Amino acid sequence: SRHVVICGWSESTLECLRELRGSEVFVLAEDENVRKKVLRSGANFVHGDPTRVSDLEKANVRGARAVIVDLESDSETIHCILGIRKIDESVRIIAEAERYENIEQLRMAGADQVISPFVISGRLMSRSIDDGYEAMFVQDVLAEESTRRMVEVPIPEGSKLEGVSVLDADIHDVTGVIIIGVGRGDELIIDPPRDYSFRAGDIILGIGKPEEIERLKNYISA
Amino acid sequence: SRHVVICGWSESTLECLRELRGSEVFVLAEDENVRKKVLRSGANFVHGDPTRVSDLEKANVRGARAVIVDLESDSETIHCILGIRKIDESVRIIAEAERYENIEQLRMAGADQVISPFVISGRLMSRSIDDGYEAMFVQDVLAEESTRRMVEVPIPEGSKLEGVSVLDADIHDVTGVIIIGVGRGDELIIDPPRDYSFRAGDIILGIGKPEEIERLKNYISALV
Ligand SMILES: [Ca+2]
Ligand SMILES: [Ca+2]
Ligand SMILES: [Ca+2]
Ligand SMILES: [Ca+2]
Ligand SMILES: [Ca+2]
Ligand SMILES: [Cl-]
Ligand code: NA
Ligand code: NA
Ligand code: NA
Ligand code: NA
Ligand code: NA
Ligand code: NA
Ligand code: NA
Ligand code: NA
């Protein structure tokens, strides 16, 4: 599988790096005094300005399967994105937005996915006044350390599930996996209606025990 | 209901403020020049250093139902929490952690809940390499803009659901609401097993359309 490029160094990219152990990752960042922490976290380090195209080419963005961008300001992030788009117009770009008003400029510049940590945080804060169950849920399921995992399971060509409505699929009853969504391309249907019918290519977004996930994979197999 | 206190002014507490319109909110922050923006967002403003116990008392932390803390550094944040605990040992405290290494210290200092935007973000980024469904899910369900809402529904005393296993309740089947979890006290069970039995007081964590939500509400309602 192809390498990932991470542009910029933050607490966010540190956590990303920790989740990307095993994959080949290149971190392109200005601050030299982090080289040791990047290598110790299982990534290659490339000193450079991620807003300069010359430096982006040092990280081989053309041959990257995705680029992750989180620079100190949204203005710097935007320039980085624009730099990437000058080299590879198609490569997948994930970017972090520091400010809500700047999200649309990030998509405009060419980001395929924008994450807004402070918007997520602020909304979780408001749902946490009485008890923190929602914040607990989000923080628990994303952590590949807990008993429940959030998974994306693709429906293979020729699946036993082609043309079967989610009601007929009865996935939670059969496999133990909760279906929270169905996605295809850039669209996600959360809590699909009973009458939606699966196609090969659809991605099931689910939550389950490790054992339940494997059951779902076998259930939807050809 | 009692007021909420927010300590600090950041992109997080701004976004928090937007979700708390209608509620009584007090924002305590050092920079006087954010008053207009705070008042314009439906909160009262209290100029002061949230790390000083005296300034916290201006914000009436004692009678607050929760205090939200997000200061520029974790070091300041901890001091704010320590001050709050000097005033009220029981009040619910929600805090934002800026750095991973500091999370256990915020709890240590007295935070009832710590939210870590950078851990959530870094995890969502790493899950977005192939496709962004998880990020789409987390960000869609929190934005009150779609047809689906994530709700916390309490199980009332005398519910038809007291003592009933989740398998027998079959809540999603009856109401359309996906149950993602059950919570009580400080514990949350995600994707509860078939054999878990509901108690009065448990909080059902779910996702559904408003029509489904209302079905769930009547479904868990009391026996008579
Ligand atoms: Ca960042
Ligand atoms: Ca399960
Ligand atoms: Ca903050
Ligand atoms: Ca994914
Ligand atoms: Ca539903
Ligand atoms: Cl280098
Ligand atoms: Na590696
Ligand atoms: Na490419
Ligand atoms: Na069934
Ligand atoms: Na208000
Ligand atoms: Na009190
Ligand atoms: Na059933
Ligand atoms: Na049904
Ligand atoms: Na059924």
Say yes or no: B203 contacts chain A, CB-CB below 8 A: yes
Domain A1-116 has CATH 3.40.640.10: no
The answer to whether residues B204 and B171 touch, using CB atoms and an 8 Å cutoff, is yes
Pick the CATH number of B147-224 from 3.40.50.970, 1.10.3720.10, 3.40.50.300, 3.30.70.1450: 3.30.70.1450
The region, left, alpha or beta by phi > 0 then psi within -120 to 50, assigned to residue A176 is left
**Please, which residues bridge with residue A165 across strands?**
A197
Domains B117-146 and B147-224 share a fold: no
Q: What is the enclosing helix (H) or strand (E) of B185?
A: none
Identify from B98, B101, B124, B136 which residue to disrupt to test chain A contact, counting A C-beta atoms within 10 A and taking the largest count: B124
| Structure token pair of residue A39 | 């290598």
- Coil, strand or helix: which one is A150? strand
> Strand B4-7 relative to strand B66-69: parallel, antiparallel, unpaired?
parallel
Q: Breaks in chain B at C–N > 2.5 Å: after which residues? A: none
- Spell B127-155 as b/e; 16+ CB within 10 A means b: bbbebbbbbbbbbbbbeeeeebbbbebeb
DSSP A165: B
CA distance A14 to A26: 12
d(CA A100, CA B103): 25
d(C-alpha B94, C-alpha B67), whole Å? 6
Note whether A132 contacts B: Cβ–Cβ < 8 A.
Answer: yes
Q: Tell me the C-alpha distance between B147 and B56, whole Å.
A: 39
Query: Which secondary structure element, helix H or strand E, spans residue A79, and what is its range?
Result: helix A74-87
Q: In this structure, what is the dihedral angle of CA atoms A19, A98, B112, B66, given to the nearest 10 degrees?
A: -160
> What was the elucidation method?
X-ray
SS3 category, B56: helix
Residue contact B13–A143, C-beta within 8 A = no
Domain boundaries, chain B: 1-116, 117-146, 147-224
N- to C-terminal Cα separation, chain B:
29
CB contact under 8 Å between B12 and A150, yes or no, is: no
Closest CA to B173 of A178, A214, A41, A58: A178
Q: Nearest CA of chain A to the CA of B52: how many Å?
A: 23
The domain defined by B117-146 folds into 1.20.5
The answer, for A146 touching chain B at a CB cutoff of 8 Å, is yes
> Of the bound ligands, which one is closest to the alpha carbon of residue B123?
4
Asked if A132's CB is within 8 angstroms of B12's CB, the reply is no
DSSP 8-state class, residue A101? G
Distance CA A67, CA B125 (A): 10
Q: What is the resolution of this structure in A?
A: 2.5
DSSP readout, A37-48? HHHHTT-EEEES
Residues 6+ apart with CB under 8 A from A36: none
Asked if residues A80 and A69 have their Cβ atoms less than 8 Å apart, the reply is: yes
Distance CA A44, CA A25 (A): 6
The one-letter code for the residue type at B182 is V
Q: Which amino acid makes up residue B91? A: V
Task: Scan residues 49-108 of B and list those with Cβ closer than 8 Å to A.
Answer: 65-66, 68, 70, 92, 94, 96, 98-100
Rounded CA-CA distance B45/B9 in Å is 11
Residue A50 C-beta-side C-alpha neighbours within 13 Å: 31
Whether domain A147-222 has CATH 3.40.50.720: no
The answer to whether A167 contacts chain B (CB < 8 Å) is no
Is the CB of residue B190 less than 8 Å from the CB of residue A207? yes
Q: Which helix (H) or strand (E) holds A210?
A: helix A210-219
Strand partners, A45: A27
